[PDB]
Amino acid sequence: VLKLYGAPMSTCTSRVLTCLHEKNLDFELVPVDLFAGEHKQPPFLAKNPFGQIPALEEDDLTLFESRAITSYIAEKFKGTGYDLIRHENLKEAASVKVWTEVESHRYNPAIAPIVFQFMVAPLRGNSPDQTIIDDNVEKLGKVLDIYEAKLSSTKYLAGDFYSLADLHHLPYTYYLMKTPAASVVNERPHVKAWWEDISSRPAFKKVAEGMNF
Amino acid sequence: VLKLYGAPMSTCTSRVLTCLHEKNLDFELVPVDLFAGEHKQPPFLAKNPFGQIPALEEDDLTLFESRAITSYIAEKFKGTGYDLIRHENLKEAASVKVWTEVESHRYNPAIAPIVFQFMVAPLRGNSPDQTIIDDNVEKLGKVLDIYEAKLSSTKYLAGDFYSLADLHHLPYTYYLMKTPAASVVNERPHVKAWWEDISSRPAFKKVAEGMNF
Ligand SMILES: N[C@@H](CCC(=O)N[C@@H](CS)C(=O)NCC(=O)O)C(=O)O
Ligand SMILES: N[C@@H](CCC(=O)N[C@@H](CS)C(=O)NCC(=O)O)C(=O)O
C-alpha cells in the first residue's frame, strides 16, 4: 500500500495527493500531528531526518520530499491514469524536466515566503511581514512575466499538455490566491486562465477541499 | 551532437560538464560571455527566457536549468557510461530522487548565497557581506548535520553507490572549500571524507581545472 504521512491542509502533502489522484491510485493518508510536534519526534525523523511532511512508505521503501514522491509515483505507474511525465514522447518528457526545475528553483523560492508570511507566521506568533511579502511578490511577478509569455505560446508550461510541471504549482498557488497577492496571477491574462484551468481539474478539486478552513 | 552553452568557470555549467564526463559523452562547449551580458541578449533569451546559463541543444531540442539538463542526459544515456540514476534498481532510483530534491530545496538555497558573496560580490564592486555569509553558514550547517548522520550509515547520500544526488553537490561545494566557510565541511568527518571522495572522481577533476584561475 502507498502510505502517505502528512496532513490534507498542507501544501506539501497536497502536492502528492493531487498526483496520486491524477494517477487514479489507491493510497492511505496517515495523519501527522504537526500541532503536537509529531514530525519532530524520533519515529517520524526516521522517515524524514529533516522533520517535515510528507513522507511515503511503500513496503520496505521510504521516501521524503514531495516532488521526489510525485516523480517516483509518476514514473512507476506509467501508462495508468494521466500521462504526467510523458512516457512515450522523449521531446515532451524533456520539456517537463525543464519546467519542473523552473518550479523548484524559480517559482517556489518566490511564492513560498509569501504564503509562509500570510499562513504560517501567525501560527508562530508573528504578524505577516509586509516587507518579505512585497519583496517576493515582486520576485514572483518577474517569474510570472516569463510564464505569461510561455503560456501565450503553449496551453501549459511544458507544452500543449498538462504535466507534472504544472501540477507542482497547484498547492502554494492555491493559498496565494486566497491572499491580496492573488493580484500577480489575476493581472496576467494567460497566467490567470492557466491557473483557472489546472485548479479546476477533478484531481485537484478533491484535494482543494482539504486545504480549505 | 550535444551542444552545451555556458562557461567552464561557472557552477551551473560545471554541474552539467561533470555529468557529461560521468556518462562518457562527447559534446561541444559553446562559450557564453556573461561579462559582456550575452546571456541577456535576444539570441540567448531564445534558448532560455530567464537569461541564465547553461542551456543545452541536441538537434531540434533545447533545454535549460542545469539539473534538467543533467537529468535529461542521465536518462537518455542511462544504459551506458556510469549509472547515475540506477536504471536497474527502482528502489535505489527512488532514493536518488529523494536526495536530488534535498540538494535543490535544502542544500543549494543555503550554500549558493555563501558562494555568491565570496565570488560574485567583488564583481559587483562590493565586499563580501559577512552577515549573509554567517546566516547561511548556520543554515548550511544544519543541513550538513543531517548529511553527517546519513553518511555514517551509507557511503553516499542515496546509498552505498555514487549517484546524481551526490554529483549535483560538486560545483558550489568546490567553491565553498576555497573560502573560510570550508569549515562546515571539514568539521564533519563523514561529510569531509564524502567530499574528498566525490571531488576526486576523474569525471570531476577534469572539470575542477576549469573552475580554477
Ligand atoms: N522541500 C520539502 C518541504 C517540506 C515542507 O515544507 N513541509 C511543511 C509542510 S508544507 C512542514 O512540514 N512544516 C512543519 C514544520 O516545519 O514545522 C518538500 O517539498 O517536501
Ligand atoms: N537554476 C538555474 C540557475 C542558473 C544560474 O544561476 N546561472 C548563473 C551561472 S552559475 C548565471 O547565469 N549568472 C549570470 C547572471 O545571473 O547574470 C540552473 O540550475 O541552471
Short mmCIF file of N, CA and C in Angstrom, two decimals, chain B residues 28-143:
data_model
loop_
_atom_site.label_atom_id
_atom_site.label_comp_id
_atom_site.label_asym_id
_atom_site.label_seq_id
_atom_site.Cartn_x
_atom_site.Cartn_y
_atom_site.Cartn_z
N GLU B 28 30.05 19.54 -27.38
CA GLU B 28 30.64 20.81 -27.73
C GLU B 28 30.26 21.84 -26.68
N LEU B 29 31.27 22.50 -26.12
CA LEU B 29 31.04 23.61 -25.20
C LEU B 29 31.05 24.91 -25.98
N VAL B 30 29.92 25.61 -25.98
CA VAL B 30 29.80 26.88 -26.68
C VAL B 30 29.87 28.01 -25.65
N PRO B 31 30.95 28.80 -25.68
CA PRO B 31 31.08 29.85 -24.67
C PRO B 31 29.96 30.89 -24.73
N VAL B 32 29.46 31.26 -23.56
CA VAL B 32 28.56 32.39 -23.40
C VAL B 32 29.25 33.43 -22.52
N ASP B 33 29.37 34.65 -23.03
CA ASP B 33 30.10 35.70 -22.33
C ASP B 33 29.18 36.46 -21.37
N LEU B 34 29.18 36.04 -20.11
CA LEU B 34 28.40 36.72 -19.07
C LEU B 34 28.92 38.13 -18.84
N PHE B 35 30.24 38.26 -18.84
CA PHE B 35 30.91 39.54 -18.60
C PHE B 35 30.45 40.60 -19.60
N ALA B 36 30.06 40.15 -20.79
CA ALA B 36 29.58 41.04 -21.85
C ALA B 36 28.06 41.08 -21.91
N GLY B 37 27.40 40.29 -21.07
CA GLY B 37 25.96 40.29 -20.99
C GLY B 37 25.29 39.55 -22.13
N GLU B 38 26.00 38.59 -22.71
CA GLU B 38 25.48 37.84 -23.85
C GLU B 38 24.22 37.06 -23.48
N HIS B 39 24.19 36.59 -22.24
CA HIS B 39 23.08 35.78 -21.76
C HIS B 39 21.79 36.59 -21.63
N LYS B 40 21.91 37.92 -21.63
CA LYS B 40 20.76 38.81 -21.50
C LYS B 40 20.26 39.35 -22.85
N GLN B 41 20.90 38.93 -23.94
CA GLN B 41 20.51 39.39 -25.27
C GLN B 41 19.53 38.41 -25.92
N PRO B 42 18.74 38.88 -26.90
CA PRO B 42 17.67 38.07 -27.51
C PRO B 42 18.08 36.69 -28.05
N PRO B 43 19.26 36.57 -28.69
CA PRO B 43 19.67 35.25 -29.18
C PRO B 43 19.72 34.17 -28.09
N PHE B 44 20.26 34.50 -26.93
CA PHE B 44 20.32 33.53 -25.85
C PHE B 44 18.98 33.43 -25.12
N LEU B 45 18.24 34.53 -25.07
CA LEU B 45 16.91 34.51 -24.46
C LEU B 45 15.99 33.56 -25.21
N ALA B 46 16.26 33.39 -26.50
CA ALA B 46 15.51 32.43 -27.31
C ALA B 46 15.78 31.00 -26.84
N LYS B 47 16.92 30.79 -26.18
CA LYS B 47 17.26 29.48 -25.64
C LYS B 47 16.73 29.33 -24.22
N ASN B 48 16.97 30.33 -23.39
CA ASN B 48 16.46 30.35 -22.02
C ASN B 48 15.86 31.72 -21.73
N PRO B 49 14.52 31.80 -21.63
CA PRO B 49 13.88 33.10 -21.44
C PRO B 49 14.24 33.76 -20.11
N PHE B 50 14.80 32.99 -19.18
CA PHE B 50 15.24 33.53 -17.89
C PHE B 50 16.63 34.15 -17.97
N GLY B 51 17.29 34.00 -19.11
CA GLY B 51 18.57 34.65 -19.35
C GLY B 51 19.68 34.26 -18.39
N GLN B 52 19.81 32.97 -18.12
CA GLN B 52 20.94 32.45 -17.35
C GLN B 52 21.48 31.18 -17.99
N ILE B 53 22.76 30.92 -17.78
CA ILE B 53 23.39 29.70 -18.28
C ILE B 53 23.27 28.58 -17.24
N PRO B 54 23.34 27.31 -17.68
CA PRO B 54 23.55 26.87 -19.06
C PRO B 54 22.27 26.56 -19.83
N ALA B 55 22.45 26.28 -21.12
CA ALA B 55 21.40 25.75 -21.96
C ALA B 55 22.01 24.61 -22.76
N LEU B 56 21.17 23.69 -23.21
CA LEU B 56 21.61 22.55 -23.99
C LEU B 56 20.80 22.45 -25.26
N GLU B 57 21.48 22.22 -26.37
CA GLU B 57 20.81 21.92 -27.63
C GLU B 57 21.24 20.54 -28.10
N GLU B 58 20.26 19.72 -28.45
CA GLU B 58 20.51 18.44 -29.09
C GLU B 58 19.56 18.33 -30.27
N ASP B 59 20.11 18.50 -31.47
CA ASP B 59 19.30 18.60 -32.68
C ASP B 59 18.28 19.72 -32.51
N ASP B 60 16.99 19.41 -32.63
CA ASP B 60 15.95 20.44 -32.55
C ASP B 60 15.43 20.63 -31.12
N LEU B 61 16.00 19.89 -30.17
CA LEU B 61 15.62 20.01 -28.77
C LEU B 61 16.49 21.04 -28.05
N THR B 62 15.85 21.89 -27.25
CA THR B 62 16.56 22.89 -26.45
C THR B 62 16.12 22.80 -24.99
N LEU B 63 17.09 22.78 -24.08
CA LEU B 63 16.82 22.69 -22.64
C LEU B 63 17.60 23.74 -21.86
N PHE B 64 17.06 24.11 -20.70
CA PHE B 64 17.79 24.93 -19.74
C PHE B 64 17.47 24.41 -18.34
N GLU B 65 18.05 25.05 -17.33
CA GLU B 65 18.14 24.56 -15.94
C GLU B 65 19.13 23.40 -15.86
N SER B 66 20.22 23.62 -15.13
CA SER B 66 21.33 22.68 -15.08
C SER B 66 20.88 21.27 -14.71
N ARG B 67 19.99 21.17 -13.73
CA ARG B 67 19.60 19.87 -13.22
C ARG B 67 18.56 19.20 -14.12
N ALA B 68 17.91 19.99 -14.97
CA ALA B 68 17.04 19.43 -16.00
C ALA B 68 17.89 18.83 -17.11
N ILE B 69 19.01 19.48 -17.39
CA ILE B 69 19.94 19.02 -18.42
C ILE B 69 20.65 17.75 -17.98
N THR B 70 21.12 17.72 -16.73
CA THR B 70 21.78 16.51 -16.22
C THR B 70 20.78 15.36 -16.18
N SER B 71 19.55 15.63 -15.76
CA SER B 71 18.53 14.58 -15.69
C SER B 71 18.23 14.03 -17.08
N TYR B 72 18.19 14.92 -18.07
CA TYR B 72 17.91 14.50 -19.44
C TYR B 72 19.01 13.60 -19.97
N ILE B 73 20.26 13.99 -19.71
CA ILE B 73 21.42 13.22 -20.16
C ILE B 73 21.47 11.88 -19.45
N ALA B 74 21.33 11.91 -18.12
CA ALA B 74 21.39 10.69 -17.31
C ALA B 74 20.30 9.69 -17.71
N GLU B 75 19.15 10.19 -18.14
CA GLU B 75 18.04 9.33 -18.55
C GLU B 75 18.24 8.78 -19.97
N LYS B 76 18.55 9.67 -20.91
CA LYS B 76 18.68 9.27 -22.30
C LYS B 76 19.78 8.23 -22.48
N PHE B 77 20.88 8.43 -21.75
CA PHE B 77 22.05 7.57 -21.85
C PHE B 77 22.21 6.69 -20.61
N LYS B 78 21.08 6.33 -20.01
CA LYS B 78 21.08 5.61 -18.74
C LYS B 78 21.82 4.28 -18.82
N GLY B 79 21.73 3.61 -19.97
CA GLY B 79 22.27 2.27 -20.12
C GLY B 79 23.76 2.22 -20.40
N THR B 80 24.37 3.38 -20.62
CA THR B 80 25.79 3.47 -20.94
C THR B 80 26.49 4.41 -19.96
N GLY B 81 27.82 4.39 -19.95
CA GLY B 81 28.57 5.21 -19.01
C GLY B 81 28.27 4.82 -17.57
N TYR B 82 28.48 5.74 -16.64
CA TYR B 82 28.22 5.45 -15.23
C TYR B 82 26.73 5.52 -14.93
N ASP B 83 26.29 4.65 -14.02
CA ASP B 83 24.89 4.50 -13.66
C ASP B 83 24.47 5.55 -12.63
N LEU B 84 24.19 6.76 -13.10
CA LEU B 84 23.93 7.89 -12.21
C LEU B 84 22.56 7.83 -11.54
N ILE B 85 21.58 7.26 -12.23
CA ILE B 85 20.19 7.26 -11.75
C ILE B 85 19.70 5.89 -11.30
N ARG B 86 20.54 4.87 -11.44
CA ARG B 86 20.21 3.50 -11.03
C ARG B 86 19.06 2.94 -11.87
N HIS B 87 19.34 2.72 -13.15
CA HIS B 87 18.29 2.39 -14.11
C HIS B 87 17.82 0.93 -14.01
N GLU B 88 18.42 0.16 -13.11
CA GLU B 88 18.09 -1.26 -12.97
C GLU B 88 17.64 -1.63 -11.56
N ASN B 89 17.60 -0.65 -10.67
CA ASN B 89 17.11 -0.84 -9.30
C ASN B 89 16.15 0.29 -8.93
N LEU B 90 14.86 -0.01 -8.96
CA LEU B 90 13.83 1.02 -8.83
C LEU B 90 13.82 1.66 -7.44
N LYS B 91 14.28 0.92 -6.43
CA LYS B 91 14.34 1.45 -5.08
C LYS B 91 15.54 2.38 -4.91
N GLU B 92 16.70 1.97 -5.43
CA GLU B 92 17.86 2.85 -5.47
C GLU B 92 17.54 4.09 -6.29
N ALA B 93 16.84 3.89 -7.40
CA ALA B 93 16.42 5.01 -8.24
C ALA B 93 15.57 6.01 -7.46
N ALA B 94 14.64 5.50 -6.66
CA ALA B 94 13.78 6.35 -5.84
C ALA B 94 14.60 7.12 -4.81
N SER B 95 15.58 6.46 -4.21
CA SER B 95 16.43 7.10 -3.21
C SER B 95 17.22 8.25 -3.83
N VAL B 96 17.69 8.07 -5.06
CA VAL B 96 18.40 9.13 -5.75
C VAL B 96 17.48 10.34 -5.93
N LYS B 97 16.22 10.11 -6.29
CA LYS B 97 15.26 11.20 -6.46
C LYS B 97 15.08 12.00 -5.17
N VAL B 98 15.01 11.30 -4.04
CA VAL B 98 14.88 11.96 -2.75
C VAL B 98 16.01 12.95 -2.53
N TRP B 99 17.24 12.51 -2.78
CA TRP B 99 18.39 13.31 -2.38
C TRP B 99 18.79 14.34 -3.42
N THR B 100 18.35 14.18 -4.67
CA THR B 100 18.47 15.27 -5.63
C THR B 100 17.50 16.38 -5.24
N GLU B 101 16.32 16.03 -4.73
CA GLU B 101 15.37 17.04 -4.27
C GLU B 101 15.89 17.72 -3.01
N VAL B 102 16.60 16.97 -2.18
CA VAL B 102 17.22 17.56 -0.99
C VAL B 102 18.24 18.61 -1.43
N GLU B 103 19.06 18.28 -2.42
CA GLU B 103 20.06 19.23 -2.93
C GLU B 103 19.39 20.51 -3.44
N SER B 104 18.28 20.36 -4.17
CA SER B 104 17.60 21.51 -4.75
C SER B 104 16.92 22.41 -3.72
N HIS B 105 16.29 21.81 -2.72
CA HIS B 105 15.40 22.56 -1.83
C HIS B 105 15.98 22.86 -0.47
N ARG B 106 17.11 22.24 -0.14
CA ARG B 106 17.70 22.40 1.18
C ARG B 106 19.17 22.80 1.11
N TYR B 107 19.96 22.07 0.33
CA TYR B 107 21.39 22.33 0.26
C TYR B 107 21.70 23.59 -0.54
N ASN B 108 21.22 23.64 -1.78
CA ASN B 108 21.53 24.74 -2.69
C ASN B 108 21.06 26.11 -2.19
N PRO B 109 19.85 26.20 -1.61
CA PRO B 109 19.44 27.53 -1.14
C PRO B 109 20.31 28.08 -0.01
N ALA B 110 21.02 27.20 0.70
CA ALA B 110 21.88 27.61 1.80
C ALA B 110 23.30 27.91 1.34
N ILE B 111 23.83 27.10 0.42
CA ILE B 111 25.23 27.25 0.02
C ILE B 111 25.42 28.32 -1.05
N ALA B 112 24.40 28.54 -1.87
CA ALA B 112 24.53 29.45 -3.01
C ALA B 112 24.84 30.89 -2.57
N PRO B 113 24.09 31.44 -1.60
CA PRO B 113 24.38 32.81 -1.17
C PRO B 113 25.77 32.96 -0.57
N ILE B 114 26.30 31.89 0.01
CA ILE B 114 27.64 31.93 0.58
C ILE B 114 28.65 32.13 -0.55
N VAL B 115 28.56 31.28 -1.57
CA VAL B 115 29.48 31.37 -2.70
C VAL B 115 29.28 32.69 -3.46
N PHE B 116 28.04 33.16 -3.54
CA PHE B 116 27.75 34.40 -4.25
C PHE B 116 28.47 35.57 -3.60
N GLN B 117 28.41 35.64 -2.27
CA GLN B 117 29.05 36.74 -1.55
C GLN B 117 30.56 36.71 -1.71
N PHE B 118 31.15 35.52 -1.68
CA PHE B 118 32.60 35.39 -1.77
C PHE B 118 33.16 35.62 -3.17
N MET B 119 32.41 35.22 -4.19
CA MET B 119 32.97 35.16 -5.54
C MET B 119 32.29 36.07 -6.56
N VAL B 120 31.04 36.46 -6.31
CA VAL B 120 30.33 37.35 -7.22
C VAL B 120 30.28 38.80 -6.72
N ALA B 121 30.12 39.00 -5.42
CA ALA B 121 30.02 40.35 -4.86
C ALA B 121 31.17 41.27 -5.29
N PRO B 122 32.42 40.75 -5.29
CA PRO B 122 33.52 41.61 -5.76
C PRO B 122 33.38 42.04 -7.22
N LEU B 123 32.70 41.23 -8.03
CA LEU B 123 32.43 41.58 -9.42
C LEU B 123 31.32 42.62 -9.51
N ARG B 124 30.57 42.75 -8.42
CA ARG B 124 29.54 43.78 -8.31
C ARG B 124 30.13 45.06 -7.74
N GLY B 125 31.41 45.00 -7.35
CA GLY B 125 32.11 46.13 -6.79
C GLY B 125 31.98 46.23 -5.28
N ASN B 126 31.43 45.20 -4.66
CA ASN B 126 31.23 45.18 -3.21
C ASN B 126 32.13 44.18 -2.50
N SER B 127 32.32 44.39 -1.20
CA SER B 127 32.98 43.40 -0.36
C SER B 127 31.97 42.34 0.04
N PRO B 128 32.44 41.11 0.33
CA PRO B 128 31.52 40.05 0.77
C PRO B 128 30.72 40.45 2.01
N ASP B 129 29.41 40.25 1.97
CA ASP B 129 28.55 40.57 3.10
C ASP B 129 28.65 39.47 4.15
N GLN B 130 29.32 39.77 5.26
CA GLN B 130 29.59 38.76 6.29
C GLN B 130 28.32 38.33 7.01
N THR B 131 27.32 39.20 7.05
CA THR B 131 26.04 38.86 7.68
C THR B 131 25.31 37.77 6.89
N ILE B 132 25.27 37.93 5.57
CA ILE B 132 24.64 36.94 4.70
C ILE B 132 25.43 35.64 4.73
N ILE B 133 26.76 35.76 4.75
CA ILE B 133 27.62 34.59 4.84
C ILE B 133 27.32 33.83 6.13
N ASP B 134 27.37 34.52 7.26
CA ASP B 134 27.21 33.87 8.56
C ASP B 134 25.83 33.22 8.72
N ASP B 135 24.79 33.91 8.28
CA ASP B 135 23.43 33.40 8.41
C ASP B 135 23.23 32.12 7.60
N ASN B 136 23.76 32.11 6.38
CA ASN B 136 23.62 30.94 5.52
C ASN B 136 24.61 29.82 5.87
N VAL B 137 25.72 30.17 6.51
CA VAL B 137 26.64 29.16 7.02
C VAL B 137 25.96 28.40 8.16
N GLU B 138 25.17 29.11 8.95
CA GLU B 138 24.41 28.49 10.03
C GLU B 138 23.39 27.53 9.43
N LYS B 139 22.65 28.02 8.43
CA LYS B 139 21.67 27.20 7.72
C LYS B 139 22.30 25.96 7.08
N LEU B 140 23.42 26.15 6.39
CA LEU B 140 24.08 25.05 5.70
C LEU B 140 24.59 24.03 6.71
N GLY B 141 25.05 24.51 7.86
CA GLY B 141 25.47 23.64 8.95
C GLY B 141 24.38 22.68 9.39
N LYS B 142 23.16 23.18 9.53
CA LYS B 142 22.03 22.35 9.92
C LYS B 142 21.75 21.26 8.89
N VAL B 143 21.88 21.60 7.62
CA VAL B 143 21.70 20.63 6.55
C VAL B 143 22.79 19.57 6.62
#
